[PDB]
């Protein structure tokens, strides 16, 4: 059965026919939940904001710039590439960059290298169209988005499959947070261009559309002061008193 031919025949994307898409992961999810910091968040216009005010340096950065391709204030790859992400990333740290499906797959890699990362995974968000069976440069209908994982310094699969969201819904699948958190990469987690709707325990969310803020740099740093400076986010809290 050729699902490419089938898509040509019917309009049902081949990913509509992927099926089913040890346990133990539930305990790990529970440890993550126990060690998570309180959600912290800050309304900031990132184009005018000195991101060096965001301290301390982060173990994980999730970067979700609002690309114009998402709509059919937008950020171009010119804008994104000029963010000084290297100035707030910890010497050993990770980045997850939503790159879209067009020139971002190239320019996002330039960004990763510019900020000092090397790409170690390419996570594809594959969009089904079970419910509703073109870029001038495009050769094919684009039915997926890429989130690039980068590393600097010294149970999941690289696919997320959900239905294509309604028009104008720009949210990314919350499953990306699950993948990131299951890596147990450390506890200082920054989500740039997040929204009220993406605020989450264990994350600092910074973005222009946030309606409220609670970020205080000293309070935030106090979550990671000794004896908690090196926890992975997947281990029990350290007994106080």
């Amino acid at each position: 059965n050729d699902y490419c031919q089938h898509f040509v025949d019917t309009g049902h994307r081949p990913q509509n026919f992927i099926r089913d898409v040890r346990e133990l992961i539930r305990l790990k999810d529970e440890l993550i939940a126990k060690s998570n910091t309180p959600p912290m968040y800050l309304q900031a216009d990132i184009e005018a904001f000195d991101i060096r005010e965001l301290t301390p340096k982060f173990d994980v950065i999730l970067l979700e710039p609002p690309l114009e391709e998402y709509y059919r204030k937008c950020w171009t790859w010119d804008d994104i590439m000029k963010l000084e992400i290297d100035e707030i990333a910890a010497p050993r740290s990770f980045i997850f960059l939503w790159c879209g499906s067009g020139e971002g797959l190239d320019l996002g890699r330039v960004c990763l290298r510019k900020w000092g990362y090397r790409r170690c995974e390419d996570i594809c968000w594959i969009k089904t169209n079970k419910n509703n069976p073109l870029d001038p440069k495009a050769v094919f209908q684009r039915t997926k988005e890429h989130c690039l994982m980068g590393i600097k310094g010294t149970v999941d699969i690289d696919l997320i499959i959900t239905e294509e969201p309604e028009i104008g819904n720009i949210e990314k699948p919350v499953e990306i947070f699950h993948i990131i958190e299951h890596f147990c990469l450390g506890r200082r987690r920054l989500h740039l261009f997040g929204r009220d709707s993406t605020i989450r325990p264990g994350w600092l969310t910074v973005g222009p559309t946030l309606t409220n803020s609670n970020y205080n740099a000293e309070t935030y740093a106090s979550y990671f002061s000794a004896p908690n400076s090196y926890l992975t986010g997947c281990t029990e809290e350290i007994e106080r008193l």
Partner: protein, 198 residues
């Protein structure tokens, strides 16, 4: 000439100028990540003579996700799409930091192709895994619908890869099998004794 054609050769050394021009090139290189090519040998492949206007399909994994983009650009292409093949078993279930459920194929464009059927297919293939390193046959159908009837060339193919409208190059093909008279003629003057060396 419509039926399958092929040349057993070392792609590093074949004079590919004898083959003419192609609407589509596909390559599944043995990236240095049996025999492989070094990064320099890949860069030096004479891909630029194979097309004037058309598309290149380039399979990549691991750090060839980046090296393949470098070669694509060096050879004169712009990457304009990226196909992913979701690998399933016979029951449509998906088979370092993450498990890998897919393989990637970069799509490059050179010049200004006219008369291709862009947008008929989507950029996700769902198809069963077969032998080690065997790409899914769906890609030939997508390419045929994109560019029906035109001349195509596959680099680093194996015997199961030979297809009508395609010329297949690779060093585990069985001899030389050419039927297009223009290609036969140019092959004979360039290789009068049938030996492809140096």
């Amino acid at each position: 000439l419509f039926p399958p054609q092929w040349i057993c050769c070392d792609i590093r050394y074949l004079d590919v100028s004898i083959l003419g021009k192609f609407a589509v090139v596909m390559a599944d290189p043995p990236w240095d990540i049996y025999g492989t090519l070094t990064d320099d040998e890949m860069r030096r492949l004479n891909i630029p003579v194979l097309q004037d206007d058309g598309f290149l399909f380039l399979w990549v994994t691991g750090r060839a996700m980046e090296l393949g983009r470098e070669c694509l650009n060096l050879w004169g292409y712009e990457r304009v799409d990226e196909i992913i093949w979701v690998k399933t078993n016979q029951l449509q279930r998906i088979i370092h930091w993450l498990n890998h459920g897919k393989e990637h194929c970069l799509v490059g464009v050179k010049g200004n192709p006219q008369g291709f059927n862009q947008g008929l297919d989507c950029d996700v293939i769902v198809a069963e895994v077969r032998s080690t390193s065997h790409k899914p046959d769906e890609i030939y159908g997508m390419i045929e619908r994109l560019s029906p009837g035109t001349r195509k060339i596959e680099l680093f193919g194996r015997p199961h890869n030979v297809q009508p409208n395609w010329i297949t190059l690779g060093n585990q093909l069985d001899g030389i099998h050419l039927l297009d008279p223009d290609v036969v003629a140019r092959f004979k003057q360039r290789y009068p004794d049938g030996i492809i060396s140096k």
